[PDB]
Structure 1
């Protein structure tokens, strides 16, 4: 089985974007879907949608990329330059509100799971609650 489903989804997204895929299918879960909501809201992906593979439900994440570049390596710039899981099984990471990291001095996001739902660093900071530091994305 999967030891960390959330990290599995993040790695699926990483490996997909690294080869400039159209979309990627991740085994569906409410937590994963709530994270994908933040992703699409922040513009790292074109969005997601629930789908069905042969018998089981999945989530199609439609990836996002920049314009085709000039010169050698015309591959476009990545919209998700970096996506890393922080609170892994075996070392869980919880932070207070005064301990939420400012990712890339603003240009990134940090996804938290708080008692008021799955939020971003700025969202949680405005709400005034902390929680589990799921992952950093920029």
Structure 2
């Protein structure tokens, strides 16, 4: 798949995506692109399994030196998004590490909390099921 425009991204990998999703939701835009990193790919995979975005495709160049993921949002028929609000926890500077007893529940389980404990990014419900916690990336509801 081809583009015409230069693709740039912020140095912080969680809030870069967070701005993209929130701005796309706010601007009613559907398709956006950014550079690919393994954390962003992993957070998007669990994100698409839970059903907040429709498709998420990561692509690579013909030289194998750069990869960019171009994702689209899952709008319903009336063109109101499925995402309502995004907020980041493990901000730069202040790294958020929480054990299981203080593992948050976002909107009584309606939203999902992204926690990368030991096996990559992982949802709050399965984190409670495994009774293991760790880094908390962002809140999405």
Structures share a fold, TM > 0.5?
A: yes
Aligned partners of 2:134 and 2:36: how far apart in 1? 23
Deviation of the 1:52 alpha carbon: 4.4
Q: Which runs of 5 or more residues in structure 2 are unaligned?
A: 1-8
Moved over 4 A (4+): 52-55
* 1:60 match: 70
Contact residue 56 and residue 69 of structure 2 kept, 8 A: yes
TM-score of the superposed pair, with normalisation by structure 2:
0.85
Distance 1:118 1:32 in 2: 10
Partner Cα distance (1:121, 1:127) in 2: 10
Per-residue deviation, 1:26: 1.8
Distance in 2, Cα, partners of 1:89 & 1:25: 23
Instruction: Please say if 1:90 is aligned against 2:93.
Output: yes
Query: Which deviates more from structure 2 when the two are superposed, residues 44-53 or residues 97-106?
Result: 44-53
Distance 1:127 1:24 in 2: 34
1:87-137 C-alpha deviation (Å, 9 max, x unpaired): 011111111111111111111100001112210110111111100110000
